[PDB]
Amino acid sequence: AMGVPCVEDEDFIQALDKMMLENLQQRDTMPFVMLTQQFKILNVPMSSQLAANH
């Protein structure tokens, strides 16, 4: 489950982690509704922790 994994996949993974960490500090399925005024419906899977718990 790696594909054709490069030395620049490592860099991205590390780049992505840092990017989330960096941008904060300065400051079968289940239907859910999403806000937008307007509402829209998303199918959340049973896999997820939002479904798996609820």
């Binding site: 030395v7 996949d9 992505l16 941008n23 859910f32 997820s48 939002l50």
Partner: protein, 772 residues
Amino acid sequence: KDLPIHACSYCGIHDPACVVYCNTSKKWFCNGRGNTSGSHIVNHLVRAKCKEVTLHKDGPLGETVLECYNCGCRNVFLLGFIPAKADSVVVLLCRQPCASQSSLKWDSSQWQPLIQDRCFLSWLVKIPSEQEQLRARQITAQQINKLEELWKENPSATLEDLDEEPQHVLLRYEDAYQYQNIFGPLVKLEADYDKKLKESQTQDNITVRWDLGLNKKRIAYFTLPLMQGDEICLRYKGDLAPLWKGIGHVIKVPDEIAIEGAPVEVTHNFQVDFVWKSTSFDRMQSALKTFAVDETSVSGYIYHKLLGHEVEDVIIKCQLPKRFTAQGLPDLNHSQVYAVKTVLQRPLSLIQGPPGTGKTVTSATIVYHLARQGNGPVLVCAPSNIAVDQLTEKIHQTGLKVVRLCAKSREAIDSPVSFLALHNQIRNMDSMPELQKLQQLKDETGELSSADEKRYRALKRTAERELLMNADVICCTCVGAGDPRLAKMQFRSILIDESTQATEPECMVPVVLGAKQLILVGDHCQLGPVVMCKKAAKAGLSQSLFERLVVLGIRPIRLQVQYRMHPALSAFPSNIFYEGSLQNGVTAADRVKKGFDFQWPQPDKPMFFYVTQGQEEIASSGTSYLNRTEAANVEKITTKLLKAGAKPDQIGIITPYEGQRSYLVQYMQFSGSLHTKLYQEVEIASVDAFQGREKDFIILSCVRANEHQGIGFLNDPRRLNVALTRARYGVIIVGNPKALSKQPLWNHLLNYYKEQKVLVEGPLNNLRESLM
């Protein structure tokens, strides 16, 4: 068409539910990982250092910029969902401050990043299925790295666009985009080469003659110091009639050429230019593009099989008939039945049809049963019009509705199946007497007034759609499959005869029209496609689809029973080229020609090698060889066969060299004992001219008497195979063993003929064995 505006700028996936617009970069990216460790948008946002995205109109959320409900912040790296309590609503907030404990009231403790496991949340942006991603362009983390940098000041660039030599043809391909990048250039080399060649064939001071203008349109005949329907431009130079210019199509190939207002009083000073058309090359590129860009053009199975990927075997859910023999056609043999049976249950098959083994009837039988699965018309092709015409006729015998589609430039050409030609079927549609009326006017006049013409064209499209849409079978050349009239049409089942004689891009023109069941018929031990440009040929364009697949390890089904040769003649080629697998459908008794009192060196084996030890010489051309002694011996053998009873038009003389072919015709004209006409009907040519053709008796003239690399059947096993499998009743090889034996294939041949006691010497009357 190209890909849509919203296609992933890395891999081209364009499902609206999967694509995310980067607002800074003004480009789209899918939410599939592909070959990378993270989704394609996330790959892009990290590298390009963007944070602001929008979803797609035709997607689920509609066209919404992703932003914090509370404060409007668009930074996807700060965004996540939180759910209400006991309630199935969910909002997008930035974690801090908007989604923080004190700031909130909603459940801050269940906040979930927009970006999960290096992708956008699947349940907001759909993740392309694996079959979709395996179909997309296979870009690697590193190529993205490079592509993303090539965009820092050339945003319009692609992976395809990242001099010297062209890339060599591969066996396996990452995807069809690589396939196009490899073949595309090669096709461009042949097109540019061909064009240059055609425009260099142009000739200056040609004497033209005419045919009476009683047939409305006029004919022009001339001989120059090359195919039917080829557009030729004739221009008159001089002052016997004002400077003239006219285009005509070739109707008679060769010396004499013949092409169907003009100055029919004058003879001398005409100029011949050969008009070049890009059509076939244009169509080939088109197919390569369609293959790369349109996921519907061929089935997932066929896509992956053609590119050399591992694909699990699939049984086609078709129904086998009760009797495999088609109506109108004679009973198939065990070998042919097994082929038909096997191929109907598979999405992709190769049939190998050795010389004499019944390809056409087998293919016609297969097409008949496909036709009756009822899933629209079967598409049947071949690289050449003669092969299509042969297959078209056999299919028609089964009583199916067949339409022969041909080039508009070849509509004046006749063939036994002209009556099946679309243009002729349209002319005979009594159901549309308006079209017939407007067609009457066209044929008694020059092209018609713009109102008349719009109407004519409209009804002609109607006629065309009527005939094609209702056809059980459509027959045309590979390249002819790219005709505009068949665009807009899906072909689930396709069969290509003689595919080993087309280049891949050629062969792929029909395949990219919806193939879900593809059958390639051919023989990779007989001649392959002609490729005029060395650079392209060396780069691998001479390899056919059939061949590549065979090398890949796909094992063709072989038609095993041959019906053409006397057993003695099949023996050697069978053993060397066909794994000793050919069975004889005709007995020795069955293959003694009637009215033929010829005394073979061994009576029951009708073949031999006559030793000639002539010196070769270079033909005053400067560019070939001839052997005068050998040619003498050939006429004498030709004369004996004629005296023995053989029909002249059933004698073929095959020779690798023009110089020999040319000398050989001259010699018999000026030095044979028999009447001059009799020899004149004996066909003399290269093996290329005898492909797919047969004679009662074949004489080979090898010409070379010194050590030599050789051209033609002297050094090509496939050409030797064809050379030895044209004759029904007998074959005689004339050459120098010492010269030929250097080649190990000929060594075997000579050792075999010797072992059969049929390598001989001395005068024909008193022929003896050769003690070499």
